[PDB]
């Protein structure tokens, strides 16, 4: 998270830490429904040898766990609920070429006990707006490759998809309507290693809930200028989550 | 450049 | 003679019936006893749907005549994350309940509204759901901490 302040205790009860059983933390996700743990899909599989990807290249549910009512980077509180993995599904049109459908979800081992420091986020009835200010949160690195020691987050606004498509295309990189963009035009304020899977949420003030537009899944470096944080688009494959995960709001 | 936010980011 | 002996005329139970409905009865007459919608025979403990007896040749009934006991529909199915309170705890026919879930942190699918009436047949039913019990589900995106600054 670049350029961000800490998030105070109990205002993002749905971030959820995906680290390895040694403890380092290595992406983020966002707990739906009772059981099950929405984020990037190129956090749960290896490094491409064969460059295609296969089910072998997956990480095992063994490998790591995911914690609930996480504060701290690496300290802990009472409020920290570690849980195994149980299954893990990426999207079937996920490409870890292009990055495009970047998305998976993590079915948990054991379900937390909800409090007020551990309960999902609201999924998306409807597509995103330009200008929409989000809030985006993540453990990951900072400015300068630092660390943060709670959990960091900024409010960017969403950009539009014309000018992120054509934001990229010096790159010659696709931005495909499976991912949304966010970030202001004169850099800084983004997210970064560390911070995928993380949520990207905002409020309906109509229902007064939060709900989750996007998850963090690639970029241009870390808060570039004329460069914008690329999201993976939660309304676009909803369909297929609430087909695999079948919570609902 | 172009690098995932993940921990190793899988930079190109 | 023509009847033979004549058993004691029967005394329908409370809440019951008596079939067939004679005046008298006697040798060979056979009567099967029921209860009233929303009651069972109860006969040397046993809950029935109905119960025989027969007039005897020496003038005797086969069988005293049973009660009929109220259908209880006992303790409702606990329901996963949720709770259950009481309007009437009777817990037999008529009787209803309530079924909550554990807000807020659950809430329910609102396909039923939550009541539950013990039916005829000893079964909790909804007018929705009938005799399903309702789901909870989990409540999204409301935290109990603001944001300062």
């Given at each position: 998270?670049?350029?961000?302040?800490?998030?105070?205790?109990?205002?993002?009860?749905?971030?959820?830490?995906?680290?390895?059983?040694?403890?380092?933390?290595?992406?983020?996700?966002?707990?739906?429904?009772?059981?099950?743990?929405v984020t990037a899909a190129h956090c749960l599989?290896?490094?491409?040898?064969?460059?295609?990807?296969?089910?072998?290249?997956?990480?095992?549910?063994?490998?790591?766990?995911?914690?609930?009512?996480?504060h701290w980077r690496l300290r802990s509180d009472?409020?920290?609920?570690?849980?195994?993995?149980?299954?893990?599904?990426?999207?079937?049109?996920?490409?870890?070429?292009?990055?495009?459908?970047?998305?998976?979800?993590?079915?948990?081992?054991?379900?937390?006990?909800?409090?007020?420091?551990?309960?999902?986020?609201?999924?998306?009835?409807?597509?995103?707006?330009?200008?929409?200010?989000?809030?985006?949160?993540?453990?990951?690195?900072?400015?300068?490759?630092?660390?943060?020691?709670?959990?960091?987050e900024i409010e960017i606004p969403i950009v539009?998809?014309?000018?992120?498509?054509?934001?990229?295309?010096?790159?010659?990189?696709?931005?495909?309507?499976?991912?949304?963009?966010?970030?202001?035009?004169?850099?800084?304020?983004?997210?970064?290693?560390?911070?995928?899977?993380?949520?990207?949420?905002?409020?309906?003030?109509?229902?007064?809930?939060?709900?989750?537009?996007?998850?963090?899944?690639?970029?241009?470096?870390?808060?570039?200028?004329?460069?914008?944080?690329?999201?993976?688009?939660?309304?676009?494959?909803?369909?297929?989550?609430?087909?695999?995960?079948?919570?609902?709001? | 450049?172009?690098?995932?936010?993940?921990?190793?980011?899988?930079?190109? | 003679?023509?009847?033979?002996?004549?058993?004691?005329?029967?005394?329908?139970?409370?809440?019951?019936?008596?079939?067939?409905?004679?005046?008298?009865?006697?040798?060979?007459?056979?009567?099967?006893?029921?209860?009233?919608?929303?009651?069972?025979?109860?006969?040397?403990?046993?809950?029935?749907?109905?119960?025989?007896?027969?007039?005897?040749?020496?003038?005797?009934?086969?069988?005293?005549?049973?009660?009929?006991?109220?259908?209880?529909?006992?303790?409702?199915?606990?329901?996963?994350?949720?709770?259950?309170?009481?309007?009437?705890?009777?817990?037999?026919?008529?009787?209803?309940?309530?079924?909550?879930?554990?807000?807020?942190?659950?809430?329910?699918?609102?396909?039923?509204?939550?009541?539950?009436?013990?039916?005829?047949?000893?079964?909790?039913?909804?007018?929705?759901?009938?005799?399903?019990?309702?789901?909870?589900?989990?409540?999204?995106?409301?935290?109990?901490?603001?944001?300062?600054?």
């Amino acid at each position: 998270i670049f350029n961000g302040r800490p998030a105070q205790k109990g205002t993002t009860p749905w971030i959820a830490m995906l680290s390895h059983l040694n403890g380092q933390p290595f992406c983020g996700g966002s707990l739906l429904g009772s059981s099950w743990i929405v984020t990037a899909a190129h956090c749960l599989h290896q490094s491409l040898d064969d460059p295609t990807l296969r089910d072998s290249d997956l990480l095992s549910p063994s490998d790591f766990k995911i914690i609930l009512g996480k504060h701290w980077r690496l300290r802990s509180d009472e409020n920290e609920q570690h849980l195994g993995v149980k299954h893990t599904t990426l999207h079937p049109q996920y490409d870890p070429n292009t990055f495009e459908n970047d998305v998976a979800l993590v079915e948990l081992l054991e379900s937390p006990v909800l409090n007020a420091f551990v309960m999902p986020i609201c999924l998306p009835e409807g597509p995103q707006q330009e200008g929409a200010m989000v809030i985006v949160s993540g453990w990951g690195k900072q400015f300068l490759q630092r660390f943060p020691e709670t959990l960091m987050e900024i409010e960017i606004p969403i950009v539009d998809h014309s000018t992120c498509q054509k934001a990229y295309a010096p790159l010659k990189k696709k931005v495909t309507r499976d991912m949304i963009c966010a970030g202001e035009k004169e850099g800084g304020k983004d997210a970064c290693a560390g911070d995928s899977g993380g949520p990207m949420v905002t409020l309906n003030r109509e229902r007064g809930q939060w709900y989750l537009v996007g998850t963090v899944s690639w970029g241009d470096d870390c808060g570039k200028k004329d460069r914008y944080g690329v999201y993976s688009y939660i309304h676009h494959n909803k369909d297929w989550i609430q087909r695999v995960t079948g919570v609902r709001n | 450049g172009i690098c995932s936010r993940s921990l190793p980011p899988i930079c190109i | 003679s023509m009847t033979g002996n004549e058993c004691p005329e029967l005394q329908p139970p409370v809440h019951g019936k008596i079939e067939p409905s004679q005046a008298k009865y006697f040798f060979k007459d056979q009567v099967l006893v029921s209860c009233d919608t929303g009651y069972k025979v109860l006969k040397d403990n046993v809950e029935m749907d109905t119960f025989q007896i027969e007039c005897l040749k020496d003038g005797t009934w086969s069988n005293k005549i049973p009660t009929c006991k109220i259908v209880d529909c006992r303790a409702p199915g606990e329901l996963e994350h949720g709770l259950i309170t009481f309007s009437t705890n009777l817990t037999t026919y008529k009787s209803e309940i309530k079924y909550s879930c554990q807000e807020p942190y659950y809430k329910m699918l609102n396909n039923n509204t939550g009541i539950y009436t013990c039916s005829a047949q000893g079964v909790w039913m909804n007018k929705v759901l009938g005799r399903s019990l309702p789901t909870c589900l989990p409540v999204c995106g409301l935290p109990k901490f603001s944001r300062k600054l």
